mmCIF file of C-alpha atoms and ligand atoms in Angstrom:
data_model
loop_
_atom_site.group_PDB
_atom_site.id
_atom_site.type_symbol
_atom_site.label_atom_id
_atom_site.label_comp_id
_atom_site.label_asym_id
_atom_site.label_seq_id
_atom_site.Cartn_x
_atom_site.Cartn_y
_atom_site.Cartn_z
ATOM 1 C CA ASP T 1 0.000 0.000 0.000
ATOM 2 C CA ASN T 2 2.034 2.916 1.364
ATOM 3 C CA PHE T 3 5.184 0.819 1.899
ATOM 4 C CA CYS T 4 8.142 0.139 -0.387
ATOM 5 C CA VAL T 5 9.517 -3.327 0.477
ATOM 6 C CA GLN T 6 7.522 -6.084 2.193
ATOM 7 C CA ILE T 7 8.844 -9.443 3.416
ATOM 8 C CA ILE T 8 6.619 -12.007 5.169
ATOM 9 C CA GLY T 9 8.566 -14.792 6.883
ATOM 10 C CA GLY T 10 11.546 -14.633 4.553
ATOM 11 C CA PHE T 11 14.289 -17.253 4.783
ATOM 12 C CA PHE T 12 17.515 -16.518 2.904
ATOM 13 C CA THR T 13 20.773 -18.483 2.743
ATOM 14 C CA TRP T 14 24.019 -17.407 1.109
ATOM 15 C CA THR T 15 24.959 -21.026 0.422
ATOM 16 C CA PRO T 16 22.582 -22.892 -1.942
ATOM 17 C CA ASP T 17 21.554 -25.587 0.581
ATOM 18 C CA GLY T 18 22.883 -24.404 3.942
ATOM 19 C CA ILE T 19 21.679 -22.992 7.252
ATOM 20 C CA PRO T 20 19.419 -19.903 6.891
ATOM 21 C CA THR T 21 21.528 -16.811 7.502
ATOM 22 C CA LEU T 22 18.244 -14.861 7.567
ATOM 23 C CA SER T 23 15.313 -16.388 9.459
ATOM 24 C CA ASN T 24 11.748 -15.129 10.060
ATOM 25 C CA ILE T 25 12.388 -11.919 8.123
ATOM 26 C CA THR T 26 9.461 -9.497 8.401
ATOM 27 C CA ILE T 27 10.018 -6.002 6.996
ATOM 28 C CA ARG T 28 7.716 -3.022 6.309
ATOM 29 C CA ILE T 29 9.776 -0.193 4.776
ATOM 30 C CA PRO T 30 7.876 3.105 4.327
ATOM 31 C CA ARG T 31 8.034 4.950 1.018
ATOM 32 C CA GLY T 32 9.559 8.419 0.996
ATOM 33 C CA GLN T 33 10.991 8.041 4.510
ATOM 34 C CA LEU T 34 14.311 7.129 6.110
ATOM 35 C CA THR T 35 14.565 3.563 7.402
ATOM 36 C CA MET T 36 17.646 2.741 9.472
ATOM 37 C CA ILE T 37 18.876 -0.809 10.107
ATOM 38 C CA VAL T 38 20.918 -1.177 13.295
ATOM 39 C CA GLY T 39 22.650 -4.143 14.872
ATOM 40 C CA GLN T 40 25.933 -5.722 15.857
ATOM 41 C CA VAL T 41 28.720 -6.971 13.579
ATOM 42 C CA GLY T 42 27.577 -9.703 11.198
ATOM 43 C CA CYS T 43 23.910 -9.783 12.222
ATOM 44 C CA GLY T 44 22.735 -9.653 8.601
ATOM 45 C CA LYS T 45 22.185 -5.967 7.769
ATOM 46 C CA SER T 46 24.053 -6.177 4.455
ATOM 47 C CA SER T 47 22.472 -9.603 3.957
ATOM 48 C CA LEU T 48 19.023 -8.061 4.500
ATOM 49 C CA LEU T 49 19.819 -5.311 1.975
ATOM 50 C CA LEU T 50 20.973 -7.837 -0.629
ATOM 51 C CA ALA T 51 18.075 -10.202 0.144
ATOM 52 C CA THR T 52 15.614 -7.433 -0.692
ATOM 53 C CA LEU T 53 17.513 -7.057 -4.000
ATOM 54 C CA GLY T 54 17.272 -10.755 -4.902
ATOM 55 C CA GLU T 55 21.022 -11.350 -4.522
ATOM 56 C CA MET T 56 20.284 -14.123 -1.993
ATOM 57 C CA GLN T 57 18.254 -17.209 -2.848
ATOM 58 C CA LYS T 58 14.926 -17.475 -1.037
ATOM 59 C CA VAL T 59 14.014 -20.637 0.864
ATOM 60 C CA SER T 60 10.613 -19.549 2.184
ATOM 61 C CA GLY T 61 8.474 -16.445 2.466
ATOM 62 C CA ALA T 62 7.651 -13.811 -0.116
ATOM 63 C CA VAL T 63 9.108 -10.435 -1.095
ATOM 64 C CA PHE T 64 6.839 -7.658 -2.382
ATOM 65 C CA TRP T 65 7.873 -4.424 -4.106
ATOM 66 C CA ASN T 66 5.243 -1.692 -4.462
ATOM 67 C CA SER T 67 7.445 0.681 -6.492
ATOM 68 C CA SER T 68 9.207 -5.894 -10.771
ATOM 69 C CA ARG T 69 11.691 -4.492 -8.260
ATOM 70 C CA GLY T 70 12.817 -1.593 -10.437
ATOM 71 C CA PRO T 71 16.146 0.218 -10.155
ATOM 72 C CA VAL T 72 17.570 0.787 -6.674
ATOM 73 C CA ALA T 73 20.402 3.195 -5.878
ATOM 74 C CA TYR T 74 22.870 1.050 -3.928
ATOM 75 C CA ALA T 75 26.041 2.019 -2.054
ATOM 76 C CA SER T 76 27.844 -1.166 -1.040
ATOM 77 C CA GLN T 77 29.779 -1.517 2.208
ATOM 78 C CA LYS T 78 32.890 -1.989 0.083
ATOM 79 C CA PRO T 79 32.838 1.079 -2.221
ATOM 80 C CA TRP T 80 32.733 0.029 -5.865
ATOM 81 C CA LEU T 81 34.624 2.254 -8.300
ATOM 82 C CA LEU T 82 34.590 2.193 -12.091
ATOM 83 C CA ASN T 83 37.702 2.598 -14.232
ATOM 84 C CA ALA T 84 36.545 5.974 -15.589
ATOM 85 C CA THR T 85 36.996 9.521 -14.277
ATOM 86 C CA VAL T 86 35.476 10.942 -11.085
ATOM 87 C CA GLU T 87 32.723 12.667 -13.087
ATOM 88 C CA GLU T 88 31.762 9.375 -14.736
ATOM 89 C CA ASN T 89 32.044 7.595 -11.375
ATOM 90 C CA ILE T 90 29.472 9.997 -9.918
ATOM 91 C CA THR T 91 27.139 10.252 -12.936
ATOM 92 C CA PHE T 92 27.358 6.494 -13.724
ATOM 93 C CA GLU T 93 25.535 6.323 -17.082
ATOM 94 C CA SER T 94 23.272 9.307 -16.425
ATOM 95 C CA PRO T 95 22.830 12.719 -18.076
ATOM 96 C CA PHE T 96 25.315 15.207 -16.647
ATOM 97 C CA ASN T 97 23.542 18.084 -14.903
ATOM 98 C CA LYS T 98 26.071 20.572 -13.536
ATOM 99 C CA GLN T 99 23.625 21.819 -10.887
ATOM 100 C CA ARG T 100 22.877 18.309 -9.600
ATOM 101 C CA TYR T 101 26.555 17.315 -9.857
ATOM 102 C CA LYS T 102 27.663 20.311 -7.783
ATOM 103 C CA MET T 103 24.775 19.800 -5.334
ATOM 104 C CA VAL T 104 25.725 16.150 -4.747
ATOM 105 C CA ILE T 105 29.411 17.108 -4.455
ATOM 106 C CA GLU T 106 28.582 19.762 -1.835
ATOM 107 C CA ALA T 107 26.355 17.237 -0.038
ATOM 108 C CA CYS T 108 29.231 14.731 0.107
ATOM 109 C CA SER T 109 31.866 17.493 0.635
ATOM 110 C CA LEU T 110 33.809 16.086 -2.329
ATOM 111 C CA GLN T 111 34.812 19.504 -3.699
ATOM 112 C CA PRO T 112 38.073 20.179 -1.739
ATOM 113 C CA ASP T 113 39.302 16.610 -2.287
ATOM 114 C CA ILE T 114 38.792 16.742 -6.068
ATOM 115 C CA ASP T 115 40.576 20.103 -5.980
ATOM 116 C CA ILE T 116 43.752 18.202 -4.982
ATOM 117 C CA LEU T 117 45.857 15.855 -7.208
ATOM 118 C CA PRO T 118 46.792 16.267 -10.938
ATOM 119 C CA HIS T 119 43.231 16.677 -12.225
ATOM 120 C CA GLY T 120 39.861 17.959 -11.076
ATOM 121 C CA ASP T 121 36.791 15.712 -11.394
ATOM 122 C CA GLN T 122 38.533 14.155 -14.403
ATOM 123 C CA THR T 123 41.235 11.962 -12.819
ATOM 124 C CA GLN T 124 41.038 8.288 -13.704
ATOM 125 C CA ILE T 125 40.636 6.428 -10.401
ATOM 126 C CA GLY T 126 40.334 2.830 -9.270
ATOM 127 C CA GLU T 127 42.380 0.619 -11.543
ATOM 128 C CA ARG T 128 44.366 2.266 -14.371
ATOM 129 C CA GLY T 129 44.560 5.376 -12.187
ATOM 130 C CA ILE T 130 45.710 6.784 -8.878
ATOM 131 C CA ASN T 131 44.389 5.101 -5.753
ATOM 132 C CA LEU T 132 42.180 7.128 -3.430
ATOM 133 C CA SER T 133 41.880 7.038 0.334
ATOM 134 C CA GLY T 134 39.005 5.018 1.766
ATOM 135 C CA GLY T 135 36.971 8.084 2.691
ATOM 136 C CA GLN T 136 37.210 9.408 -0.868
ATOM 137 C CA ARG T 137 36.209 6.045 -2.377
ATOM 138 C CA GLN T 138 33.287 5.712 0.043
ATOM 139 C CA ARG T 139 32.059 9.263 -0.566
ATOM 140 C CA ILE T 140 32.333 8.901 -4.353
ATOM 141 C CA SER T 141 30.225 5.730 -4.107
ATOM 142 C CA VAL T 142 27.729 7.615 -1.914
ATOM 143 C CA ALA T 143 27.727 10.503 -4.410
ATOM 144 C CA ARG T 144 26.926 8.032 -7.192
ATOM 145 C CA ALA T 145 24.080 6.670 -5.050
ATOM 146 C CA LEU T 146 22.719 10.180 -4.378
ATOM 147 C CA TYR T 147 23.081 11.404 -7.977
ATOM 148 C CA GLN T 148 20.737 9.011 -9.787
ATOM 149 C CA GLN T 149 17.037 9.895 -10.021
ATOM 150 C CA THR T 150 15.903 6.712 -8.273
ATOM 151 C CA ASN T 151 13.146 6.610 -5.661
ATOM 152 C CA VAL T 152 14.857 3.847 -3.636
ATOM 153 C CA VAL T 153 18.300 4.505 -2.137
ATOM 154 C CA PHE T 154 20.139 1.686 -0.359
ATOM 155 C CA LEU T 155 23.086 2.828 1.771
ATOM 156 C CA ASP T 156 25.245 0.185 3.471
ATOM 157 C CA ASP T 157 27.316 2.001 6.144
ATOM 158 C CA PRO T 158 28.381 5.208 4.336
ATOM 159 C CA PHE T 159 30.269 6.266 7.488
ATOM 160 C CA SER T 160 32.623 3.270 7.694
ATOM 161 C CA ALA T 161 35.760 5.344 7.025
ATOM 162 C CA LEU T 162 34.502 8.880 7.674
ATOM 163 C CA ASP T 163 35.216 11.281 10.530
ATOM 164 C CA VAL T 164 32.591 13.208 12.512
ATOM 165 C CA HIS T 165 32.464 16.379 10.391
ATOM 166 C CA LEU T 166 32.205 14.774 6.946
ATOM 167 C CA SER T 167 29.708 12.152 8.141
ATOM 168 C CA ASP T 168 27.564 14.817 9.833
ATOM 169 C CA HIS T 169 27.576 17.035 6.739
ATOM 170 C CA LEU T 170 26.813 14.000 4.566
ATOM 171 C CA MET T 171 23.937 12.996 6.870
ATOM 172 C CA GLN T 172 22.402 16.482 6.948
ATOM 173 C CA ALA T 173 23.021 17.806 3.419
ATOM 174 C CA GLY T 174 22.575 14.499 1.613
ATOM 175 C CA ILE T 175 20.054 12.456 3.591
ATOM 176 C CA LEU T 176 17.977 15.129 5.327
ATOM 177 C CA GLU T 177 18.044 17.663 2.449
ATOM 178 C CA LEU T 178 18.889 16.133 -0.967
ATOM 179 C CA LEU T 179 16.827 12.984 -0.342
ATOM 180 C CA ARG T 180 13.931 14.520 1.619
ATOM 181 C CA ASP T 181 12.988 17.168 -0.967
ATOM 182 C CA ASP T 182 12.263 14.600 -3.694
ATOM 183 C CA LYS T 183 10.933 12.128 -1.062
ATOM 184 C CA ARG T 184 13.203 9.247 -2.045
ATOM 185 C CA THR T 185 12.999 6.026 -0.038
ATOM 186 C CA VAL T 186 16.258 5.820 1.927
ATOM 187 C CA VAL T 187 17.350 2.645 3.711
ATOM 188 C CA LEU T 188 20.433 3.469 5.780
ATOM 189 C CA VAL T 189 22.457 0.773 7.518
ATOM 190 C CA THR T 190 24.725 2.495 10.034
ATOM 191 C CA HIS T 191 26.613 1.878 13.267
ATOM 192 C CA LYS T 192 26.344 5.559 14.277
ATOM 193 C CA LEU T 193 23.365 5.716 16.636
ATOM 194 C CA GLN T 194 23.520 9.522 16.907
ATOM 195 C CA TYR T 195 21.339 9.713 13.765
ATOM 196 C CA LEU T 196 18.566 7.600 15.335
ATOM 197 C CA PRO T 197 16.390 10.699 16.110
ATOM 198 C CA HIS T 198 16.385 11.415 12.348
ATOM 199 C CA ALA T 199 14.858 7.972 11.629
ATOM 200 C CA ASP T 200 11.254 7.619 10.506
ATOM 201 C CA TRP T 201 11.545 3.813 10.678
ATOM 202 C CA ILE T 202 14.044 1.644 12.571
ATOM 203 C CA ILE T 203 14.972 -2.004 11.956
ATOM 204 C CA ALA T 204 16.693 -3.894 14.781
ATOM 205 C CA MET T 205 18.568 -7.089 13.900
ATOM 206 C CA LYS T 206 20.238 -9.692 16.106
ATOM 207 C CA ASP T 207 21.965 -12.887 14.868
ATOM 208 C CA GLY T 208 20.324 -13.143 11.466
ATOM 209 C CA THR T 209 16.788 -12.339 12.620
ATOM 210 C CA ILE T 210 14.970 -9.036 13.011
ATOM 211 C CA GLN T 211 14.124 -8.030 16.571
ATOM 212 C CA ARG T 212 11.840 -4.976 16.381
ATOM 213 C CA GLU T 213 10.412 -2.373 13.995
ATOM 214 C CA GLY T 214 8.745 1.025 14.081
ATOM 215 C CA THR T 215 9.746 4.419 15.416
ATOM 216 C CA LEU T 216 11.719 5.226 18.582
ATOM 217 C CA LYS T 217 8.434 5.664 20.477
ATOM 218 C CA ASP T 218 7.700 1.993 19.785
ATOM 219 C CA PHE T 219 11.173 1.152 21.123
ATOM 220 C CA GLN T 220 10.391 3.099 24.319
ATOM 221 C CA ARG T 221 7.935 0.480 25.621
ATOM 222 C CA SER T 222 8.315 -2.930 23.957
ATOM 223 C CA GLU T 223 12.131 -3.187 24.154
ATOM 224 C CA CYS T 224 13.333 -1.072 27.073
ATOM 225 C CA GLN T 225 16.758 -2.752 27.245
ATOM 226 C CA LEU T 226 17.647 -1.983 23.615
ATOM 227 C CA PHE T 227 16.325 1.578 23.993
ATOM 228 C CA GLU T 228 18.426 2.196 27.110
ATOM 229 C CA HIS T 229 21.417 0.601 25.353
ATOM 230 C CA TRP T 230 20.966 3.088 22.498
ATOM 231 C CA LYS T 231 20.793 5.893 25.069
ATOM 232 C CA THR T 232 24.007 4.718 26.752
ATOM 233 C CA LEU T 233 25.957 4.308 23.496
ATOM 234 C CA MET T 234 25.450 8.010 22.692
ATOM 235 C CA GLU T 235 15.556 11.268 25.669
ATOM 236 C CA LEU T 236 15.984 9.727 22.189
ATOM 237 C CA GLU T 237 13.094 11.787 20.819
ATOM 238 C CA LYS T 238 12.547 11.899 17.064
ATOM 239 C CA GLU T 239 14.239 14.838 15.279
ATOM 240 C CA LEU T 240 51.353 16.158 -37.718
ATOM 241 C CA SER T 241 53.555 15.408 -40.727
ATOM 242 C CA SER T 242 56.633 15.006 -38.509
ATOM 243 C CA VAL T 243 54.730 12.371 -36.516
HETATM 244 N N1 LIG M 301 28.723 -12.829 0.384
HETATM 245 C C1 LIG M 301 28.580 -13.621 1.452
HETATM 246 N N2 LIG M 301 28.771 -14.950 1.296
HETATM 247 C C2 LIG M 301 28.632 -15.749 2.358
HETATM 248 N N3 LIG M 301 28.315 -15.423 3.614
HETATM 249 C C3 LIG M 301 28.131 -14.103 3.739
HETATM 250 C C4 LIG M 301 28.241 -13.153 2.735
HETATM 251 N N4 LIG M 301 27.981 -11.885 3.231
HETATM 252 C C5 LIG M 301 27.725 -12.093 4.498
HETATM 253 N N5 LIG M 301 27.799 -13.409 4.876
HETATM 254 C C6 LIG M 301 27.563 -13.950 6.211
HETATM 255 O O1 LIG M 301 26.317 -13.457 6.665
HETATM 256 C C7 LIG M 301 26.408 -13.035 8.044
HETATM 257 C C8 LIG M 301 26.100 -11.558 8.154
HETATM 258 O O2 LIG M 301 26.945 -10.807 7.257
HETATM 259 P P1 LIG M 301 26.574 -9.339 6.811
HETATM 260 O O3 LIG M 301 27.549 -8.832 5.824
HETATM 261 O O4 LIG M 301 25.122 -9.324 6.345
HETATM 262 O O5 LIG M 301 26.638 -8.508 8.167
HETATM 263 P P2 LIG M 301 26.604 -6.974 8.589
HETATM 264 O O6 LIG M 301 26.173 -6.906 10.054
HETATM 265 O O7 LIG M 301 25.807 -6.166 7.644
HETATM 266 O O8 LIG M 301 28.147 -6.591 8.530
HETATM 267 P P3 LIG M 301 29.260 -5.865 9.418
HETATM 268 O O9 LIG M 301 30.312 -6.949 9.678
HETATM 269 O O10 LIG M 301 29.859 -4.804 8.489
HETATM 270 O O11 LIG M 301 28.656 -5.300 10.659
HETATM 271 C C9 LIG M 301 27.786 -13.476 8.534
HETATM 272 O O12 LIG M 301 27.720 -14.746 9.173
HETATM 273 C C10 LIG M 301 28.612 -13.533 7.245
HETATM 274 O O13 LIG M 301 29.652 -14.502 7.327
#
């Protein structure tokens, strides 16, 4: 109805005939809102993101897309980089709009870093080019995710190798401004719980199964231990002829 991705009792294994890495998956992602998946290391957040994309085989349950999935803007936990220039890494087979390109660059704070080095927004990077630092690779992948005119945006820990200032500016200018104005569906896996007030929907995962759902107000009563743990980790209220 008003939700983007629906899973009812989904079972997903990475191996073809192994133990279910994801068990009893139930997910109700709102459309046009920010949904944040939180959990410990290796509890299946990236696996949940890829299971919604069909990258994992399904043992049981059903997956519904009300957007026939359609395109999804995805920023992997390991930042993927093409062999082309920075401009083509950000546009990624899209029409080049200078206004949108500069807006996404200012949202990711990529301008002063592309000012460095032999070329500006035209250096070949990845293979057949100069290597970039992990923050630059991650933010170029995030800029590619933010650039495309896609209603669904999947972000898998954009703040893995980012400091406080760049991650905060990325969170505000990208997620709360560049993605809210066009009402794109943003699913944001993160280990930074300081952005939990900015979450319309929250997914809690624990050992390959999903613990809770809803807003922080729902976490206030049903799961008091997890709510107090979130409070302690950071009252959690929302918001040539010679040649
Ligand atoms: N491509 C893969 N092939 C096989 N097993 C995988 C693969 N990706 C993840 N797994 C397994 O699935 C489980 C959860 O991994 P996943 O990457 O979803 O966790 P995560 O919580 O998102 O990651 P992080 O370690 O960054 O917190 C682990 O047991 C891991 O070994």
